[PDB]
Design an enzyme around this catalytic site. Structure first.
Site, PDB file in Angstrom:
ATOM      1  N   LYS A 218       0.804  -1.219   0.000  1.00 28.81           N
ATOM      2  CA  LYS A 218       0.000   0.000   0.000  1.00 28.81           C
ATOM      3  C   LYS A 218       0.842   1.277   0.000  1.00 28.81           C
ATOM      4  CE  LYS A 218      -3.079   1.612   3.633  1.00 28.81           C
ATOM      5  NZ  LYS A 218      -2.031   1.469   4.667  1.00 28.81           N
TER       6      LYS A 218
ATOM      7  N   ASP B  17      -9.540  -3.039  12.194  1.00 21.92           N
ATOM      8  CA  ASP B  17      -8.754  -2.901  13.412  1.00 21.92           C
ATOM      9  C   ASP B  17      -9.345  -1.844  14.335  1.00 21.92           C
ATOM     10  OD1 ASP B  17      -6.894  -4.847  12.766  1.00 21.92           O
ATOM     11  OD2 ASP B  17      -5.539  -3.435  11.790  1.00 21.92           O
ATOM     12  N   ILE B  18      -9.323  -2.127  15.637  1.00 16.56           N
ATOM     13  CA  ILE B  18      -9.880  -1.196  16.614  1.00 16.56           C
ATOM     14  C   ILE B  18      -9.088   0.105  16.610  1.00 16.56           C
ATOM     15  CG2 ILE B  18     -10.503  -0.901  19.037  1.00 16.56           C
ATOM     16  CD1 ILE B  18     -10.677  -3.922  19.271  1.00 16.56           C
TER      17      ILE B  18
ATOM     18  N   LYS C  56     -14.935 -12.364  -2.647  1.00 15.14           N
ATOM     19  CA  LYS C  56     -15.612 -12.190  -1.363  1.00 15.14           C
ATOM     20  C   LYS C  56     -14.847 -11.380  -0.316  1.00 15.14           C
ATOM     21  CE  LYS C  56     -19.003 -13.711  -0.613  1.00 15.14           C
ATOM     22  NZ  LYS C  56     -20.368 -13.155  -0.636  1.00 15.14           N
TER      23      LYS C  56
ATOM     24  N   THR D 146     -12.897  -8.825  -0.781  1.00 16.41           N
ATOM     25  CA  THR D 146     -13.046  -7.424  -1.154  1.00 16.41           C
ATOM     26  C   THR D 146     -14.458  -6.923  -0.874  1.00 16.41           C
ATOM     27  OG1 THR D 146     -11.314  -7.594  -2.816  1.00 16.41           O
ATOM     28  CG2 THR D 146     -12.917  -5.837  -3.100  1.00 16.41           C
TER      29      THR D 146
ATOM     30  N   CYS E 187      28.271   5.003  10.128  1.00 18.32           N
ATOM     31  CA  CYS E 187      28.171   5.213  11.571  1.00 18.32           C
ATOM     32  C   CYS E 187      28.967   4.216  12.421  1.00 18.32           C
ATOM     33  CB  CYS E 187      26.690   5.205  11.969  1.00 18.32           C
ATOM     34  SG  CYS E 187      26.339   5.960  13.565  1.00 18.32           S
TER      35      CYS E 187
ATOM     36  N   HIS F  43      24.295   8.727   8.044  1.00 17.71           N
ATOM     37  CA  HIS F  43      23.542   7.714   7.312  1.00 17.71           C
ATOM     38  C   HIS F  43      23.262   8.163   5.882  1.00 17.71           C
ATOM     39  CE1 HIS F  43      22.662   4.695  10.368  1.00 17.71           C
ATOM     40  NE2 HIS F  43      22.561   5.683  11.237  1.00 17.71           N
TER      41      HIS F  43
ATOM     42  N   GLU G 106      22.612   6.675   3.168  1.00 20.47           N
ATOM     43  CA  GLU G 106      21.492   5.999   2.521  1.00 20.47           C
ATOM     44  C   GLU G 106      20.170   6.749   2.646  1.00 20.47           C
ATOM     45  OE1 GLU G 106      23.026   5.107   5.143  1.00 20.47           O
ATOM     46  OE2 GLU G 106      21.798   4.055   6.623  1.00 20.47           O
TER      47      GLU G 106
HETATM   48  O1  LIG Z   1     -22.055 -23.479   0.317  1.00 19.18           O
HETATM   49  C1  LIG Z   1     -22.606 -22.532  -0.122  1.00 19.18           C
HETATM   50  C2  LIG Z   1     -24.047 -22.538  -0.267  1.00 19.18           C
HETATM   51  C3  LIG Z   1     -24.709 -21.491  -0.755  1.00 19.18           C
HETATM   52  N1  LIG Z   1     -23.973 -20.170  -1.207  1.00 19.18           N
HETATM   53  C4  LIG Z   1     -24.619 -19.020  -1.752  1.00 19.18           C
HETATM   54  O2  LIG Z   1     -23.941 -18.608  -2.965  1.00 19.18           O
HETATM   55  C5  LIG Z   1     -23.945 -17.170  -3.021  1.00 19.18           C
HETATM   56  C6  LIG Z   1     -22.702 -16.656  -3.672  1.00 19.18           C
HETATM   57  O3  LIG Z   1     -21.638 -16.960  -2.822  1.00 19.18           O
HETATM   58  P1  LIG Z   1     -20.086 -16.905  -3.342  1.00 19.18           P
HETATM   59  O4  LIG Z   1     -19.241 -17.640  -2.426  1.00 19.18           O
HETATM   60  O5  LIG Z   1     -19.855 -17.618  -4.585  1.00 19.18           O
HETATM   61  O6  LIG Z   1     -19.616 -15.343  -3.458  1.00 19.18           O
HETATM   62  P2  LIG Z   1     -19.375 -14.572  -4.878  1.00 19.18           P
HETATM   63  O7  LIG Z   1     -19.678 -15.431  -6.010  1.00 19.18           O
HETATM   64  O8  LIG Z   1     -20.338 -13.509  -5.067  1.00 19.18           O
HETATM   65  O9  LIG Z   1     -17.837 -14.008  -4.956  1.00 19.18           O
HETATM   66  P3  LIG Z   1     -16.510 -14.966  -5.049  1.00 19.18           P
HETATM   67  O10 LIG Z   1     -15.797 -15.152  -3.800  1.00 19.18           O
HETATM   68  O11 LIG Z   1     -16.754 -16.324  -5.486  1.00 19.18           O
HETATM   69  O12 LIG Z   1     -15.531 -14.487  -5.998  1.00 19.18           O
HETATM   70  C7  LIG Z   1     -23.997 -16.720  -1.596  1.00 19.18           C
HETATM   71  O13 LIG Z   1     -24.820 -15.564  -1.475  1.00 19.18           O
HETATM   72  C8  LIG Z   1     -24.577 -17.845  -0.826  1.00 19.18           C
HETATM   73  O14 LIG Z   1     -25.901 -17.505  -0.432  1.00 19.18           O
HETATM   74  C9  LIG Z   1     -22.488 -20.305  -1.008  1.00 19.18           C
HETATM   75  O15 LIG Z   1     -21.793 -19.400  -1.300  1.00 19.18           O
HETATM   76  N2  LIG Z   1     -21.892 -21.481  -0.472  1.00 19.18           N
HETATM   77  O1  LIG Z   2       0.919   0.408   8.431  1.00 20.80           O
HETATM   78  C1  LIG Z   2       0.728  -0.044   9.505  1.00 20.80           C
HETATM   79  C2  LIG Z   2       0.966   0.767  10.681  1.00 20.80           C
HETATM   80  C3  LIG Z   2       0.762   0.298  11.911  1.00 20.80           C
HETATM   81  N1  LIG Z   2       0.245  -1.170  12.174  1.00 20.80           N
HETATM   82  C4  LIG Z   2       0.021  -1.736  13.464  1.00 20.80           C
HETATM   83  O2  LIG Z   2       0.666  -3.034  13.544  1.00 20.80           O
HETATM   84  C5  LIG Z   2      -0.171  -3.908  14.321  1.00 20.80           C
HETATM   85  C6  LIG Z   2      -0.081  -5.316  13.825  1.00 20.80           C
HETATM   86  O3  LIG Z   2      -0.659  -5.342  12.555  1.00 20.80           O
HETATM   87  P1  LIG Z   2      -0.418  -6.596  11.528  1.00 20.80           P
HETATM   88  O4  LIG Z   2      -0.766  -6.195  10.183  1.00 20.80           O
HETATM   89  O5  LIG Z   2       0.977  -6.969  11.371  1.00 20.80           O
HETATM   90  O6  LIG Z   2      -1.321  -7.867  12.023  1.00 20.80           O
HETATM   91  P2  LIG Z   2      -0.696  -9.212  12.702  1.00 20.80           P
HETATM   92  O7  LIG Z   2       0.747  -9.113  12.850  1.00 20.80           O
HETATM   93  O8  LIG Z   2      -1.110  -9.341  14.082  1.00 20.80           O
HETATM   94  O9  LIG Z   2      -1.111 -10.531  11.822  1.00 20.80           O
HETATM   95  P3  LIG Z   2      -0.569 -10.832  10.304  1.00 20.80           P
HETATM   96  O10 LIG Z   2      -1.503 -10.509   9.244  1.00 20.80           O
HETATM   97  O11 LIG Z   2       0.621 -10.105   9.917  1.00 20.80           O
HETATM   98  O12 LIG Z   2      -0.194 -12.212  10.101  1.00 20.80           O
HETATM   99  C7  LIG Z   2      -1.562  -3.392  14.135  1.00 20.80           C
HETATM  100  O13 LIG Z   2      -2.296  -3.507  15.352  1.00 20.80           O
HETATM  101  C8  LIG Z   2      -1.430  -1.969  13.747  1.00 20.80           C
HETATM  102  O14 LIG Z   2      -1.834  -1.150  14.838  1.00 20.80           O
HETATM  103  C9  LIG Z   2       0.048  -1.895  10.873  1.00 20.80           C
HETATM  104  O15 LIG Z   2      -0.335  -3.009  10.896  1.00 20.80           O
HETATM  105  N2  LIG Z   2       0.300  -1.285   9.610  1.00 20.80           N
HETATM  106  N1  LIG Z   3      23.024   5.174  14.491  1.00 24.07           N
HETATM  107  C1  LIG Z   3      23.887   4.208  14.767  1.00 24.07           C
HETATM  108  O1  LIG Z   3      24.406   3.513  13.899  1.00 24.07           O
HETATM  109  C2  LIG Z   3      24.264   4.038  16.209  1.00 24.07           C
HETATM  110  C3  LIG Z   3      25.612   3.393  16.366  1.00 24.07           C
HETATM  111  C4  LIG Z   3      26.068   3.245  17.812  1.00 24.07           C
HETATM  112  N2  LIG Z   3      25.162   2.332  18.564  1.00 24.07           N
HETATM  113  C5  LIG Z   3      26.132   4.615  18.468  1.00 24.07           C
HETATM  114  O2  LIG Z   3      25.199   5.038  19.140  1.00 24.07           O
HETATM  115  O3  LIG Z   3      27.102   5.343  18.307  1.00 24.07           O
END
Ligand SMILES: O=c1ccn([C@@H]2O[C@H](COP(=O)(O)OP(=O)(O)OP(=O)(O)O)[C@@H](O)[C@H]2O)c(=O)[nH]1
Ligand SMILES: O=c1ccn([C@@H]2O[C@H](COP(=O)(O)OP(=O)(O)OP(=O)(O)O)[C@@H](O)[C@H]2O)c(=O)[nH]1
Ligand SMILES: NC(=O)CC[C@H](N)C(=O)O
Ligand SMILES: O=c1ccn([C@@H]2O[C@H](COP(=O)(O)OP(=O)(O)OP(=O)(O)O)[C@@H](O)[C@H]2O)c(=O)[nH]1
Ligand SMILES: O=C(Cc1ccc(F)cc1)Nc1nc(-c2ccccn2)cs1
Ligand SMILES: O=C(Cc1ccc(F)cc1)Nc1nc(-c2ccccn2)cs1
Ligand SMILES: O=C(Cc1ccc(F)cc1)Nc1nc(-c2ccccn2)cs1
Ligand SMILES: NC(=O)CC[C@H](N)C(=O)O
Ligand SMILES: NC(=O)CC[C@H](N)C(=O)O
Ligand SMILES: [Mg+2]
Ligand SMILES: [Mg+2]
Ligand SMILES: [Mg+2]
EC number: 6.3.4.2
Lengths: 535, 535, 535
Positions: free
Chosen positions: A20, A155-156, A197, A199, A389, A507, A509
């Site tokens: 992103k 996220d909260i 789904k 999205t 550094c 630094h 870089e």
């Molecule tokens: O097991 C089942 C039974 C029934 N349905 C029913 O099928 C409908 C469509 O559910 P989808 O899972 O296929 O979502 P989508 O096609 O719109 O998007 P994609 O993730 O596939 O890309 C849902 O509204 C649900 O009611 C299931 O999805 N799964």
């Molecule tokens: O750009 C940012 C900035 C800040 N944070 C902060 O980092 C914390 C952790 O956010 P994560 O995206 O890393 O979730 P997770 O580690 O717990 O699980 P994974 O999907 O990675 O497996 C979040 O609670 C958020 O507040 C971000 O995630 N992204």
């Molecule tokens: N910015 C850094 O590379 C710190 C290097 C080293 N720990 C110092 O404080 O001097």
């Protein structure tokens, strides 16, 4: 005349790590190449007041701005793709917003009200957002502010920043504000299908808090079918011209080409009613030439924490690659663990195949015996060295250990050392830009082609001035200092002692950019090419 | 032997002002009269670190604990219904929890993690909750902690405290934890019906965050029909024995009788498996006798901000009523605006019908010319006066203005006064309990029936010791001081000058309780009865 | 003695197509191999009263039960993995539940109440769930009912079935009810990491409606690291022994081995307090031998809609593979579009490389000229043919066109045909099982090794009895009929005319199972092996 400043809110759904920040950066580059004055900001939902308390090996490098603020590395992506210096303002966090409001409360500035999340926390966020729109130090108002909202929708911790962005949309109206939502389209291999789904549920979450997305970035490992894009546009109530298929690009520098192929920039400019002008591709076409058509290839050891790539050195790796681009070389980075280089045979095993050694610094490390031990090897082998550094500090302790000072160290790394050649002049932490003056016809002055430079600092130990004369007998020159001479800023061996061995306390870089490589990395990659060619 | 300590979480739905704190207090009294060691705590969802910044006329009085913390007035309701001193710990707020976690972050105590709302803010809340369960200063572990959760279920600011309470329920299990939810049943006059839909939606909100209520308090202007209680129990998945009809009681002291009639206490004790014993009604039956069967009636002027009841003086009004209960009088409070008493004719119009004048202090006031002017009237009319803090200061400036010192004031209220008889000894704010020694056969010593006392303080100006001898010529005695004599703590006229005119620097209304009236209010209401009877 | 019947609710998160039905089937097989009487049910959130209105090429095949109900194909997966006949009750839908409640309302069976989603729709769902627990036609109560909930948690249409399952959990208590939640762990290639955030948000959605999952199935393209499983268990409040890493298996028959390796079945049995006994692997180890160690390989043309795999023929493909397993052959399915086979040169191009031709039937097709044209080719080439329903009808119209009846067709496919050799005896739709009697030493009787059989039907046209004598001159025998002879059930050429060319009006793929292949597919794959070997 100039319009009102537009606000673009990049949000994220389903997961983090979708790229992103690189997407927002690439859109910034596209809008800049049309000739608009873009500026960028990030909001971080975490409570740390700045990342200077977090471990960089777990959470990535601390970036440093000219004014010395410590920020998330996405500010580094913004600076690299914009080629613009950004203020410390460009990284808000929850930790800062709460601390600010609580401090205003303790001073009685709310005149006896109860203080609440709404309005007071959201007013502080909204104030920090609209601050970015103010005229710069030269009086130029930006055309667009691209605020990237950290975290994931639902996220909260994100719920105050999204509420502040909704209020900005309410205050300025749709003519001035755009919402871009980034989402994941997963592929399921056993049944061979892309799923929409996630999205749908992520846009439903975004709608339940009162935001309507203007466009969708669909991140995918393969190009999304048009039938799926039509289904999303129908299910999500988004203009089909805003559904952008964004498959994984070969390199980050290709992402602007992907987005321009989808015409996302034209859709934004039109929907925001910005002054339409064509993209000038000249500079970025030259970058993509050098990126994709290397004439040669060189191996550089990055003497780091571990034998694998780390976001702790993301800017160092980018600066090495930009140095390569200047020469039209490829650079391949050998991730070498410091601890295997403590023994000379282990050092020889780690480094013998490479063409240059880069010693990076930072915080969160121990084990500089292995760093010195890689320097000691590289000097005997005749490999060029660039020390950043802590890298300089290890170079100077090597030289202390090359003359008589066999127990010399930093006071940081052996508090009982009888020779603290590196010492606190915890002392002042130097942060941000400081000026330095360079020795004429130093190797540094031949790199920069100037006698005066500035660099960004983040350190609190210094070279002990009591040992300058002693360690000069190593051969080392103090080829740059503070303008008063009080602080050593650069150290080098003379070219006849080693062709290129340079340290700096800064630094560099951080000041590098892909279209504007920094002089010291151009010099170091030159030296590595010359070693490889002569070797 | 003693069980594990139980946790009771009183939550609130539909609206504030349902009397949730008085309900929790009355349940505390019921559990105490069975012989359990109850203790209570409040969580405040607002960001002010303490109410000492808020205006008390808009947000109610600041309560003060023995240890000097400043707290919400619900801590005062708890102290009054329990007759127990509570620690400063008993009022958590969001302002404090965030400031604490951010300070731990700046010190690196989280060892390089990102700090987040979950786990770190909820861990700080859960730690502050389970802190209340620890053995007291004498080693007694409480049987129940009754934490009252401020705000309304579905306020954004409440969502961390409810999450912490859910985690406490997960950690200790249902055998140790009980949820009581308070809700409103509105009456609609045009169609003559009670509506259960708001309670259904509020319990649905509470279930969507993972809490199941064990009982419902149905607040209503009339007794809820059993058919409606059955409908709620069916719709809400609550045991019918937990649906408690709680119509508006005549006085707050009746609320324990309402709850005991519904058998809520038995349901709690059984569902928590606490040691069952019968309620000893003796003391509270004596209170309800004195409350409902007054033999006489007296009018007291409270010389306040405005001619209407204010929560700025809730504890003062309760202390006056308890003084009445000691005599079996009614006390009727004439709310008299200070500013109408600046002129002697306006003072005579405001006060001539009353039988005593109470001058309260606090913060957030100006206009003490009208306070002195009411004292000046009361002395001429022969009415008794009790002055609390600022009340004493106005008494002493009256006396300065009775001898030669016609421009005398506080330095707080005329910074240019040539005679600052009240002055900072901003100086030290004295907070909480301090000891004082009393003149033998002072009117104060005749009230307290002791020569040594302690009182709770919240002030930073003092009587200027340079004027003691001058203002003693008013007749005023400094009948109590600090044990070193350095600070004036009590002032009085001799009984032959006026029958009862007393000031104190402390807030004795804080140490009053309905079943244990404070000596100075028993004395003052005595004097008012004697004036009325003789008048 | 037998326990109370346990209820296991398999739910789904993040997306459909995660293989949730195959996971539930594999768990059913594991619990059955321990010796428990498992039974299964599916709830479909869509409003179609049955799939007989939906297109099978877009939505997959209609399955048919013994009692003739039309159901989702997951009932086919259940029948195949259990080797058990399931009632029509095993597929609930919203379309049926609403129509049932509205019909009860129109008859006044709710005695004047307003009818509501809760309680009346959820009571109908809960009634249809607990119906599955009733003693079977032989009086055996099942040990476990495994109800699979269709759709995705947070689809609007799923919210009544999840509420009914929550009420079943409330009524029977945790000792009897288990929730299994299936979720996706995506991999992001540019940054090389597995993401847990979608599972966190999906479990948060499930908790916001009052369900706590007992275990998580983590669907992934690669084995999930233990550190991630620990993070999920901590973030989701799930027992680490319930976090099941479920990477993509090579074949569906391996999924029981994956789940048993993770010990999911032991966790379920223990947490439900079921009688623990070891898995008897003997039969499934024999299946996995035949699956993974084929001695030979044969190509079969499936003459379908298009040149790609279709869920319209999922049961046909499974039955062909099971026929292969009986011979220890591989079967490779050549998906051949009917329309390319209308011309004899196009037919020769489509079929010349294969070893047998399967002509499937169903609904939602046109273009049987190309089906006959593939039969006409296969007969000349000497390839064996198996014709299912419409396949038989095309065989018999080929034979009509082989004798004199060059314009013959079905009345379904040319309403103006002068020779409707296939005709409605819209006529009665025959549904479910019907008996048939077979000619002794027919090729069919040599396949079945019995003179009496039953098969499942779903058709309304028949062979016109007026043409039997005419088309027998093709050589074709009516080697099986209804027991009264009124209906043609099987047709064959004599072995000296073609080695194996057989049609049936039924759908024998419905009675096939992987560990119990159906006789006609064992015979047909035999014939294809013999052609390949002799060819
Ligand atoms: O097991 C089942 C039974 C029934 N349905 C029913 O099928 C409908 C469509 O559910 P989808 O899972 O296929 O979502 P989508 O096609 O719109 O998007 P994609 O993730 O596939 O890309 C849902 O509204 C649900 O009611 C299931 O999805 N799964
Ligand atoms: O750009 C940012 C900035 C800040 N944070 C902060 O980092 C914390 C952790 O956010 P994560 O995206 O890393 O979730 P997770 O580690 O717990 O699980 P994974 O999907 O990675 O497996 C979040 O609670 C958020 O507040 C971000 O995630 N992204
Ligand atoms: N910015 C850094 O590379 C710190 C290097 C080293 N720990 C110092 O404080 O001097
Ligand atoms: O105008 C209408 C139309 C239809 N309904 C339907 O009537 C059903 C009952 O809706 P109610 O408003 O009467 O709620 P309640 O009886 O359960 O609780 P009370 O507030 O009255 O005490 C609701 O489920 C709704 O579907 C209305 O309530 N109002
Ligand atoms: O290659 C890397 C790793 C990396 C990270 C940061 C750097 F500075 C240098 C390298 N990341 C990539 N992200 C994409 C991408 C992103 C968005 C849309 C389409 N493609 C392609 S590659
Ligand atoms: O009378 C007052 C105003 C007041 C407030 C605080 C005081 F200390 C003294 C007076 N409040 C009352 N609340 C109830 C009530 C509350 C809960 C349940 C049933 N009844 C009856 S009266
Ligand atoms: O191979 C197919 C396509 C298919 C479908 C239905 C069939 F009857 C025959 C084939 N699907 C597969 N699903 C898995 C899987 C599922 C759950 C957990 C782990 N692995 C492996 S392969
Ligand atoms: N607590 C109070 O009554 C304060 C009174 C006065 N404002 C003072 O500070 O002295
Ligand atoms: N079940 C089927 O294959 C139907 C075949 C054909 N449409 C018929 O109804 O006879
Ligand atoms: Mg779909
Ligand atoms: Mg009603
Ligand atoms: Mg993460």
């Amino acid at each position: 005349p100039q319009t009102a400043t537009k606000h673009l809110f990049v949000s994220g759904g389903v997961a983090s790590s979708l790229g992103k920040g690189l997407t927002a950066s690439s859109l910034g580059q596209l809008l800049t190449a049309r000739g608009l004055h873009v500026t960028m900001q990030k909001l971080d939902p975490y409570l740390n007041v700045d990342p200077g308390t977090m471990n960089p090996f777990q959470h990535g490098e601390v970036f440093v701005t000219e004014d010395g603020a410590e920020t998330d590395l996405d500010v580094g992506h913004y600076e690299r793709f914009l080629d613009r210096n950004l203020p410390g303002s460009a990284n808000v966090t929850t930790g800062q917003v709460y601390s600010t409001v609580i401090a205003k409360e303790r001073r009685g500035e709310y005149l006896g009200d109860t203080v609440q999340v709404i309005p007071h926390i959201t007013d502080e966020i909204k104030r920090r957002i609209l601050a970015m729109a103010q005229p710069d130090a030269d009086g130029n108002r930006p055309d667009v502010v691209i605020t990237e909202i950290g975290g994931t929708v639902g996220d909260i911790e994100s719920q105050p920043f999204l509420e502040a962005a909704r209020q900005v949309r309410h205050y300025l109206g749709r003519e001035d504000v755009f919402f871009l939502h980034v989402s994941l389209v997963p592929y399921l291999a056993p049944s061979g299908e892309l799923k929409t789904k996630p999205t749908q549920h992520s846009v439903a979450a975004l709608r339940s808090i009162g935001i309507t997305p203007d466009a969708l970035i669909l991140r995918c490992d393969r190009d999304v079918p048009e039938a799926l894009k039509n289904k999303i546009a129908l299910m999500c109530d988004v203009d089909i011209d805003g559904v952008i298929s964004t498959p994984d690009a070969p390199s980050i520098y290709d992402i602007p080409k992907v987005l321009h192929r989808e015409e996302l920039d034209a859709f934004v400019v039109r929907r925001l009613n910005l002054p339409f002008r064509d993209v000038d591709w000249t500079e970025w076409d030259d970058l993509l030439r050098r990126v994709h058509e290397p004439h040669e290839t060189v191996r550089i050891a990055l003497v780091g924490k571990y034998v694998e790539l780390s976001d702790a050195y993301l800017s160092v790796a980018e600066a090495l690659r930009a140095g390569g681009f200047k020469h039209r070389a490829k650079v391949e980075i050998c991730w070498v663990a410091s601890d295997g280089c403590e023994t000379t045979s282990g050092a020889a095993a780690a480094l013998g195949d490479v063409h240059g050694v880069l010693i990076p610094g930072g915080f969160g490390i121990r084990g500089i015996e292995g760093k010195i031990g890689a320097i000691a090897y590289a000097r005997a082998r005749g490999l060029p060295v660039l020390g950043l550094c802590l890298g300089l500090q290890c170079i100077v302790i090597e030289a202390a250990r090359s003359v008589g000072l066999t127990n010399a160290n930093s006071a940081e790394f052996d508090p009982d050392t009888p020779d603290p050649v590196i010492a606190t002049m915890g002392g002042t932490m130097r942060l941000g830009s400081y000026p330095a003056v360079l020795e004429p016809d130093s190797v540094v002055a031949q790199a920069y082609q100037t006698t005066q430079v500035s660099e960004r600092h983040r350190h609190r130990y210094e070279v002990n001035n009591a040992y300058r004369d002693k360690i000069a007998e190593s051969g080392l020159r103090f080829s740059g200092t503070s303008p008063d001479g009080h602080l050593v800023e650069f150290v080098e061996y003379p070219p006849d002692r080693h062709p290129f061995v340079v340290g700096t306390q800064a630094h560099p870089e951080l000041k590098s950019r892909p279209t504007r490589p920094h002089p010291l990395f151009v010099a170091f990659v030159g030296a590595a090419i010359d070693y490889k060619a002569g070797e």
